Write an enzyme that holds these catalytic residues in place. Sequence first.
Site, PDB file in Angstrom:
ATOM      1  N   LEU A   1     -18.081  13.112  29.694  1.00 38.89           N
ATOM      2  CA  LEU A   1     -18.808  14.342  29.386  1.00 38.89           C
ATOM      3  C   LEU A   1     -19.896  14.505  30.443  1.00 38.89           C
ATOM      4  CD1 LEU A   1     -19.161  13.893  25.511  1.00 38.89           C
ATOM      5  CD2 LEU A   1     -17.455  15.273  26.714  1.00 38.89           C
ATOM      6  N   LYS A   2     -19.602  15.278  31.489  1.00 40.88           N
ATOM      7  CA  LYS A   2     -20.513  15.433  32.614  1.00 40.88           C
ATOM      8  C   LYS A   2     -20.490  16.874  33.104  1.00 40.88           C
ATOM      9  CE  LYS A   2     -19.470  10.888  34.461  1.00 40.88           C
ATOM     10  NZ  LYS A   2     -20.222  11.081  35.732  1.00 40.88           N
ATOM     11  N   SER A   3     -21.583  17.267  33.754  1.00 43.93           N
ATOM     12  CA  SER A   3     -21.741  18.594  34.345  1.00 43.93           C
ATOM     13  C   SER A   3     -23.053  18.606  35.123  1.00 43.93           C
ATOM     14  CB  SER A   3     -21.727  19.695  33.283  1.00 43.93           C
ATOM     15  OG  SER A   3     -22.844  19.579  32.420  1.00 43.93           O
TER      16      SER A   3
END
Lengths: 486, 318
Positions: free
Chosen positions: B102-104
Amino acid sequence: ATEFTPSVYSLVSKPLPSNSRPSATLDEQAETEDLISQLFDLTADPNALVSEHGKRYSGLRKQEHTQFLASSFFQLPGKFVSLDASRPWLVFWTVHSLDLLGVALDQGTKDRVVSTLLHFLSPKGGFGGGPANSQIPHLLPTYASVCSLAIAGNDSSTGGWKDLAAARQSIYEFFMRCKRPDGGFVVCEGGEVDVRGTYCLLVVATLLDIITPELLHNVDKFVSACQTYEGGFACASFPFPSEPSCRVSMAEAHGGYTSCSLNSHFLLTSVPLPSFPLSIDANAALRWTVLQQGEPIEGGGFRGRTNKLVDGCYSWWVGGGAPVAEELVRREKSRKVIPPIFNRVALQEFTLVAAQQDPGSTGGLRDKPGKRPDQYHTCNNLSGLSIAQHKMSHSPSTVSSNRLKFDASKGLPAVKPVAPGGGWKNEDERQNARREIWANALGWIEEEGGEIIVGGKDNRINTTTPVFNILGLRLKPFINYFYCQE
Amino acid sequence: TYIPMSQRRSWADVKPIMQDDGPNPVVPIMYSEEYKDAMDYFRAIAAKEEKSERALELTEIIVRMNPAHYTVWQYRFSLLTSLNKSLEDELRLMNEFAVQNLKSYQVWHHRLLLLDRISPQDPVSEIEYIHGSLLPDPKNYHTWAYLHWLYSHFSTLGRISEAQWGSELDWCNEMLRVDGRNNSAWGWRWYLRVSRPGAETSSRSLQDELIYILKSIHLIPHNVSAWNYLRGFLKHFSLPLVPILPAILPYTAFGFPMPSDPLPEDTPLPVPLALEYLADSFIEQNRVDDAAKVFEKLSSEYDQMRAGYWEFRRRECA
Ligand SMILES: CCCC[C@H]1CN(c2cccc(OC(F)(F)F)c2)C(=O)CN1Cc1cncn1Cc1ccc(Br)cc1
Ligand SMILES: O=S(=O)(O)C[C@H](O)CNC1CCCCC1
Ligand SMILES: O=S(=O)(O)C[C@H](O)CNC1CCCCC1
Ligand SMILES: O=S(=O)(O)C[C@H](O)CNC1CCCCC1
Ligand SMILES: [Zn+2]
């Protein structure tokens, strides 16, 4: 015209040498070289008078790309929820690509585009990635919304342009709340600071006539300090205090951030402020730009970073920055007192052969063979293809002609600055600023006789504008509306 | 079986607010029931400006389904500061966010805002976590930029000791040893050795750096990262190109490292950037005619993809 832009099929394709030193970087590069070279071997040479029997035809499948954009424009499956905060980009990537592909939208669809984007506009200033009752304003969807309204809107009561004019003060106030003392901008409340926000802000501020001295203070220094030792630009620079004692780039030279930095700096050169903007190393930026075009074995596409893989989307980021870097170099040579600087042919061959989705499939354009096509890579591939097909340059004689026709007595109400002394000194300085910014924004031309359409004239797409990345036929009526010129 | 939030006792007082997209919006997304339900109640939470634990739990549910929702991330950080929540526990949640992929842009900026507000006396634990996170992706641009900010921000506070700078160069040298073609690690070395304000600039440091550069080129003669670092190093310190030419000429076919007697296998000559060095060194000697011949060979033979650029450089010699 193609003497210094040799075709990839006419050059010897050799892998990147190993020097008997293997590494993870070389493993992916060699595998990528195999994928791209095999696809070129299966595809007929686009520069052939009659396409070869038994091999794939590389003609631009414009109707497939139109259908790919159409289905992705009326309904997204739930799997693209990660783009729920980037819906204005889904609009821009769609409507700008259709402009490039020469496909017109009917007025009913244009009105839906305008109405959807106006629901993203916050009364306190700026567009968000979605409806105003769900998402806060953000610098990047503000650019995408303003440019999409330039493509799909008009000057009537239902055209949306009158709503942008009425929101000029609030948008400006949003820009000023994003501004940091060092010259950077947060992209939103509590958001990150990088040159993407600067680029998106400066484009919108240029188009809507809301540029003030207080908005631009230290913006030139923040961008100039993003340049790295390689010649390109990083995402941001860090201000060390003792306004700051010094500024240091914070990452590698990157194709996307180099484009934003070059475009931001170029937009700042139009502003008639004393000792502004702070200079950059244009020669190093041009050198870094041309060095990112891949070898023939990798199709002649552009990579975004040194020792990384070529990517079709950098055809716009790096390729579209080349005319900007070239113009900045030309200005320095003129101040101190022609073949293409990148392979315009090879870039088109990469777009047609490698970047296009395999025929008879979903359509659209992609990062690389083996990657699914998407709206973003479709727009950037076509945007870079347009730059390669059409020789773009910033014409001083065209800028001079724009100065001679500008009407300083026409215009929208002046923006009220946040600080008491944040505006222009007097009306002579403000109107001189409006003239120079408007005249230079409309200074990009396509040079007659410089057109290169690899594979035949049926591959020709429309001409996009550097820095802004919208068609000139959209840029002129749009910026004339907000400057009240005709 | 999914339980709608309208049938949950903890949310009975909240009247959800629908997404105001218009009657027939373009680029619509077919949201799942769970995602639309959470955003319907988030719109109500943000409307009433509620800073509560259930609002915090709701933001976590949303960012797990959409880690790029910057509005929800902004609201979540305001929840943490308003409720005086444990930012270390939130930092541990971001560690669990990295394992679950879960990355951004927003997740990395959220971690930056945490470290900024925590303001630890010694950020060595976060530095080590960044080093470990770079092992699966050694060229993650967000991570390298975040590492630059971490050292820049806390050195401004005077909290980076000389031993920390030394171990950071040790780690950077190991990264380049595993992959000398990692241009991200080369840029990090430039920060540690050149651009950072506390860097030492002496005759010994210039000699040590030039030795490391030439050794890296001799190890991988076709590594563009090493050549760009060399050209940037000489230009930044205004160092002449001619004295180092003996170490570069063998690639165009003393007191500093030289190439191997027999060159490493799979090293075809000439190296194009070595020719650029030779041409620029000719310009340094005002031998514009000799430089134009090197540019002409680069344009027509050895680097034909940039034929027009090298031709432009050839015409500038006149
Ligand atoms: C479906 C979304 C795709 C994301 C893409 C584009 N993207 C972007 C989106 C909107 C605007 C804008 O920049 C602005 F605002 F226009 F200036 C940049 C990013 O941020 C990340 N990208 C990831 C990517 C894909 N292939 C190479 N990359 C690395 C990359 C990094 C930075 C830049 Br810059 C350009 C490329
Ligand atoms: O490649 S594109 O030009 O975008 C679209 C395809 O060519 C469609 N080819 C049709 C096949 C059947 C007869 C009518 C044409
Ligand atoms: O009046 S304005 O402030 O200009 C516009 C509304 O207030 C926006 N409220 C939204 C609620 C849900 C989260 C994003 C903001
Ligand atoms: O206009 S020219 O460049 O002289 C030649 C045409 O463009 C060639 N276009 C092809 C025609 C047959 C179908 C596939 C495209
Ligand atoms: Zn890409």
